[PDB]
Amino acid sequence: AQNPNCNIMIFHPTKEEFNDFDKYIAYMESQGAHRAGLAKIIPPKEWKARETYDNISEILIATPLQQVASGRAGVFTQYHKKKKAMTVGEYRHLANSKKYQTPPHQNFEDLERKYWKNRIYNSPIYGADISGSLFDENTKQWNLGHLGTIQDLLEKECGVVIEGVNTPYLYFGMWKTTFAWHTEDMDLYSINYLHLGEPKTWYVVPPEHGQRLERLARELFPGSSRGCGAFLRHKVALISPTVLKENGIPFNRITQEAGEFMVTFPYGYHAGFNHGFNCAEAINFATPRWIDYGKMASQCSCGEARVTFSMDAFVRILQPERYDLWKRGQD
Ligand SMILES: O=C(O)CNC(=O)C(=O)O
Ligand SMILES: [Mg+2]
Ligand code: NI
Ligand SMILES: [Zn+2]
**3-state SS class at 76:** strand
316/322 Cα distance (integer angstroms): 8
CA distances from 281 to 49, 167, 191, 308, 320 (A): 11, 10, 8, 17, 32
The reply to whether 6 sits in an annotated binding site is no
Q: Which ligand is nearest to the CA of 88?
A: 2
Indicate which atom in ligand 1 lies nearest the CA of residue 173: 3
Indicate which atom in ligand 1 lies nearest the CA of residue 192: 9
Q: Ligand 3 mean position to 192 CA, how many Å?
A: 8
Q: Which ligand is nearest to the CA of 231?
A: 4
For residue 124, which of 103, 153, 145, 152 has the smallest C-alpha distance?
103
Range of the domain at 31: 1-331
Q: Using CB atoms within 10 A of its CB, is residue 250 exposed (0-12), middle (13-18) or buried (19+)?
A: middle
> What is the side-by-side strand order in the sheet with 278-285?
9-11, 38-41, 261-264, 189-197, 278-285, 169-173, 125-131, 65-72, 75-82, 237-239
Q: Which amino acid is at 78?
A: Q
* Pair type for strands 9-11 and 38-41: parallel
Q: What is the DSSP string of 230-295?
A: TGGGG--EEE-HHHHHHTT---EEEEE-TT-EEEEPTT-EEEEEESSSEEEEEEEE--TTHHHHHH
Supply angle C-alpha 97, 124, 265, rounded to 5. 125
Q: Using CB atoms within 10 A of its CB, is residue 320 exposed (0-12), middle (13-18) or buried (19+)?
A: exposed
Q: What is the DSSP string of 49-75?
A: S-S-STT-TT-EESS-EEEEEEEETTE
**3-state SS class at 116:** helix
Helices (H) and strands (E) in the chain, counts: 10, 16
- The experimental technique behind this entry is X-ray
Q: Ligand 2 mean position to 59 CA, how many Å?
A: 5
Q: What is the DSSP letter of 41?
A: E
CA R_g for the chain: 19
The reply to whether 80 sits in an annotated binding site is no
The reply to whether 300 sits in an annotated binding site is yes
CATH of the domain at 165: 2.60.120.650
Resolution value in angstroms: 1.1
65/85 Cα distance (integer angstroms): 10
The reply to whether 96 sits in an annotated binding site is no
Q: What is the DSSP string of 195-237?
A: EEES-EEEEEE-GGGHHHHHHHHHHHSHHHHHH-TTGGGG--E
237/277 Cα distance (integer angstroms): 23
Q: Using CB atoms within 10 A of its CB, is residue 17 exposed (0-12), middle (13-18) or buried (19+)?
A: middle
User: Rounded to the nearest 10 degrees, what angle do helices 320-330 and 311-318 cross at?
Assistant: 150
116/25 Cα distance (integer angstroms): 33
Q: Ligand 3 mean position to 281 CA, how many Å?
A: 11
For residue 195, which of 14, 94, 59 has the smallest C-alpha distance?
59
232/230 Cα distance (integer angstroms): 6
228/212 Cα distance (integer angstroms): 17
* Pair type for strands 252-256 and 9-11: unpaired
**Cβ-contact 163, 314 below 8 angstroms:** no
CA distances from 118 to 103, 135, 187 (A): 11, 35, 31
Number of domains, the chain: 1
Q: How many CB atoms lie within 10 A of CB 42?
A: 14
Q: How many CB atoms lie within 10 A of CB 123?
A: 16
* Pair type for strands 169-173 and 178-182: unpaired
Nearest CA to ligand 1 atom 9: 192
Q: Ligand 2 mean position to 104 CA, how many Å?
A: 30
146/138 Cα distance (integer angstroms): 10
**Cβ-contact 281, 170 below 8 angstroms:** yes
The reply to whether 200 sits in an annotated binding site is yes
Q: How many CB atoms lie within 10 A of CB 148?
A: 14
Indicate which atom in ligand 1 lies nearest the CA of residue 128: 3
Give residues whose Cβ lies within 5 Å of ion ligand 4. 228, 300, 302, 304
Q: Ligand 4 mean position to 70 CA, how many Å?
A: 19
For residue 307, which of 176, 169, 211, 193 has the smallest C-alpha distance?
169
Q: State the DSSP H helix or E strand holding residue 97, giving kind and residue range, or none if neither.
A: none
Any residues with Cβ below 6 Å from ligand 1, and which?
171, 179, 190, 192, 200, 264, 280, 282
Indicate which atom in ligand 1 lies nearest the CA of residue 264: 10
Q: Which amino acid is at 212?
A: R
Q: What is the DSSP letter of 311?
A: H
Q: Which amino acid is at 31?
A: Q
Q: What is the DSSP letter of 48?
A: -
Ligand 1 pocket test, pick from 126, 171, 234 with the greatest ligand atom count within 8 Å of Cβ, gives: 171
